[PDB]
Predict the structure of designed protein CTPR3.
Amino acid sequence: NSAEAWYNLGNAYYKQGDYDEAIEYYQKALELDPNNAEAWYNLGNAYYKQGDYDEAIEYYQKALELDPNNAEAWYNLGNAYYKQGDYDEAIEYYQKALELDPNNAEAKQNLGNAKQKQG
Ligand SMILES: [Pb+2]
Ligand SMILES: [Pb+2]
């Protein structure tokens, strides 16, 4: 209801690259409906695009608790850990992404690179 309205507005602002606004609007939506997995996921993405990887991780984790079939979310969580230098975590989440979407070339590549980084 208003939760959907806020989510819709977050999405519009997200797509235009206004992350600060999108983050505000997603947070409003989730105050009203905390079960919207796509709102958690997109909030995560918006923080990720801001370079705020610890927030991204928090919100990706919440999205995946609600929707553990979101292959892209597993991949982006892996990216977020990779950005923090947490290559063990990145590797795990990339492996999970590829189980659901074996065709994610970038997941395979980052997984490979992450394995090099640890050694
Ligand atoms: Pb936090
Ligand atoms: Pb873990």
Notes: Helices lie at 2-15, 19-32, 37-49, 53-66, 71-83, 87-100, 105-118. Residues 71 and 97 are 5 Å apart (CA to CA). Residues 89, 92 surround lead (II) ion (ligand 2) (CB under 6 Å). The chain is about 80% helix and 0% strand.
